Write an enzyme that holds these catalytic residues in place. Structure first.
Site, mmCIF file in Angstrom:
data_model
loop_
_atom_site.group_PDB
_atom_site.id
_atom_site.type_symbol
_atom_site.label_atom_id
_atom_site.label_comp_id
_atom_site.label_asym_id
_atom_site.label_seq_id
_atom_site.Cartn_x
_atom_site.Cartn_y
_atom_site.Cartn_z
ATOM 1 C CD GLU A 67 -4.458 70.928 -7.803
ATOM 2 O OE1 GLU A 67 -4.916 70.341 -6.787
ATOM 3 O OE2 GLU A 67 -4.847 70.770 -8.988
ATOM 4 C CE1 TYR A 108 -7.481 83.767 -2.889
ATOM 5 C CE2 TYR A 108 -5.195 83.708 -2.119
ATOM 6 C CZ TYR A 108 -6.525 84.028 -1.918
ATOM 7 O OH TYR A 108 -6.903 84.638 -0.740
ATOM 8 C CG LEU A 134 12.907 79.805 -3.238
ATOM 9 C CD1 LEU A 134 11.852 80.772 -3.692
ATOM 10 C CD2 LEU A 134 13.205 80.024 -1.735
ATOM 11 C CG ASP A 171 5.867 73.053 0.278
ATOM 12 O OD1 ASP A 171 6.157 72.117 1.062
ATOM 13 O OD2 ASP A 171 4.823 72.988 -0.406
ATOM 14 C CG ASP A 182 -4.104 81.608 4.148
ATOM 15 O OD1 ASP A 182 -4.758 81.253 3.134
ATOM 16 O OD2 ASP A 182 -4.158 80.953 5.215
ATOM 17 C CG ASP A 212 0.491 82.472 -2.091
ATOM 18 O OD1 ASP A 212 0.954 82.878 -3.171
ATOM 19 O OD2 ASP A 212 -0.211 81.440 -2.080
HETATM 20 O O1 LIG Z 1 3.823 74.202 -2.924
HETATM 21 N N1 LIG Z 1 4.501 74.194 -4.197
HETATM 22 O O2 LIG Z 1 3.698 74.276 -5.364
HETATM 23 C C1 LIG Z 1 5.822 74.184 -4.439
HETATM 24 C C2 LIG Z 1 6.532 72.986 -4.384
HETATM 25 C C3 LIG Z 1 7.875 72.980 -4.758
HETATM 26 C C4 LIG Z 1 8.487 74.148 -5.205
HETATM 27 C C5 LIG Z 1 7.811 75.366 -5.263
HETATM 28 N N2 LIG Z 1 8.472 76.477 -5.638
HETATM 29 C C6 LIG Z 1 8.012 77.734 -5.552
HETATM 30 N N3 LIG Z 1 8.801 78.795 -5.801
HETATM 31 C C7 LIG Z 1 8.424 80.068 -5.716
HETATM 32 C C8 LIG Z 1 7.110 80.347 -5.379
HETATM 33 C C9 LIG Z 1 6.285 79.256 -5.092
HETATM 34 C C10 LIG Z 1 4.995 79.513 -4.638
HETATM 35 C C11 LIG Z 1 4.418 80.720 -5.009
HETATM 36 C C12 LIG Z 1 3.144 81.040 -4.559
HETATM 37 C C13 LIG Z 1 2.474 80.161 -3.719
HETATM 38 C C14 LIG Z 1 3.069 78.989 -3.275
HETATM 39 C C15 LIG Z 1 2.238 78.109 -2.335
HETATM 40 N N4 LIG Z 1 1.345 77.277 -3.160
HETATM 41 C C16 LIG Z 1 1.434 75.950 -3.241
HETATM 42 N N5 LIG Z 1 0.485 75.583 -4.098
HETATM 43 C C17 LIG Z 1 -0.107 76.700 -4.527
HETATM 44 N N6 LIG Z 1 0.478 77.725 -3.913
HETATM 45 C C18 LIG Z 1 4.329 78.658 -3.763
HETATM 46 N N7 LIG Z 1 6.737 77.991 -5.198
HETATM 47 C C19 LIG Z 1 6.469 75.346 -4.878
#
Ligand SMILES: O=[N+]([O-])c1cccc(/N=C2/N=CCC(c3cccc(Cn4cncn4)c3)=N2)c1
EC number: 2.7.11.22
Length: 290
Positions: free
Chosen positions: A12, A15, A76, A79, A120, A138
């Site tokens: 989450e 945005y 990917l 994180d 950010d 992001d």
């Molecule tokens: O933080 N994650 O949702 C997370 C956990 C495990 C794997 C993940 N894999 C990707 N891969 C490509 C892009 C991507 C991602 C893209 C935009 C924002 C984010 C950060 N975010 C984490 N929650 C919401 N945004 C991650 N996550 C993401």
């Protein structure tokens, strides 16, 4: 969206929510971000599709349907924050820390040359693979909407990585803010504790001031004229980094000190960072990925 199987909620955002999903055609698996988006937003986001770099999470598509905007990203598998929680017990070795900070600086050196800032940065938006790459996720999202105080799920958007010029009210800040964030993240990976964990804006500023010294016109010309500067700010004495990031070696403390200069104009650029002696011996280890 018809073209994707959501396979799981992975996260989450501020945005929106991220799902792992599968292109129902390519069968590519992607990270699908769900956020008629008021349309500088569209223009400025659709633009990032050409801001392409190996240490930038590829933005493969934008799809704007009804009142919803999906951003479609290469997937990917995890994180930086979970990997760092996954190594509380021992910490990331130093050689992997260096390689990540190196790769992240390359990412930023690229964005910043194309006048794009992230604004950010934070461990949650740094994504890692099993081949020892780390990428920034992001972009342009903070310019295109501004960062709110909660997320869409009413969650608190963290101030821990936010540069002091932003906390002081500066409207027009620069690529230096991302260098300040990356500095905070670098200190956090070395010590396994966030460096400045503020729980509000003045708490964030004061944790900053406590470690680095309350800023004045000596160290930051123009600072007493900043919008949220107050004369009444308590006056703390600066502290020696050897205390803040043990056991970083001298070259890494020297670089950290430069990424954390109060004056955005003196704060080392990414380009300059890439030349610093701390990286003379940098190698690309393989992460232990689980
Ligand atoms: O933080 N994650 O949702 C997370 C956990 C495990 C794997 C993940 N894999 C990707 N891969 C490509 C892009 C991507 C991602 C893209 C935009 C924002 C984010 C950060 N975010 C984490 N929650 C919401 N945004 C991650 N996550 C993401």
């Amino acid at each position: 969206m018809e073209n994707f199987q959501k396979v799981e909620k992975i996260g989450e955002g501020t945005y929106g929510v991220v799902y792992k999903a599968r292109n129902k055609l390519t069968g590519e698996v992607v990270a699908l971000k769900k956020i008629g988006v008021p349309s500088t937003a569209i223009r400025e986001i659709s633009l990032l599709k050409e801001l392409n770099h190996p240490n930038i999470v590829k933005l493969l598509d934008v799809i704007h349907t009804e009142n919803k905007l999906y951003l479609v990203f290469e997937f990917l598998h995890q994180d930086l924050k979970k990997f760092m929680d996954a190594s509380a017990l021992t910490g990331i070795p130093l050689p992997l820390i260096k390689s990540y900070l190196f790769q992240l600086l390359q990412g930023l050196a690229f964005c910043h040359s194309h006048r794009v800032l992230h604004r950010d940065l934070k461990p949650q938006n740094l994504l890692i693979n099993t081949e020892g790459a780390i990428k920034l996720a992001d972009f342009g999202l903070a310019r295109a909407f501004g960062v709110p105080v909660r997320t869409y799920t009413h969650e608190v958007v963290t101030l821990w990585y936010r540069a002091p010029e932003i906390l002081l009210g500066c409207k027009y800040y620069s690529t230096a803010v991302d260098i300040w964030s990356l500095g905070c993240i670098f200190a956090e990976m070395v010590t396994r504790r966030a460096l400045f964990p503020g729980d509000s804006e003045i708490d964030q500023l004061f944790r900053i001031f406590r470690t680095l010294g309350t800023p004045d016109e000596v160290v930051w010309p123009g600072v007493t004229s900043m919008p949220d500067y107050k004369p009444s700010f308590p006056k703390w004495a600066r502290q020696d980094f050897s205390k803040v990031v043990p056991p970083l070696d001298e070259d890494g403390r020297s670089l950290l000190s430069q990424m954390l200069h109060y004056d955005p104009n003196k704060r080392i650029s990414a380009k300059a960072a890439l030349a610093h002696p701390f990286f003379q011996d940098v190698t690309k280890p393989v992460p232990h990925l689980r």
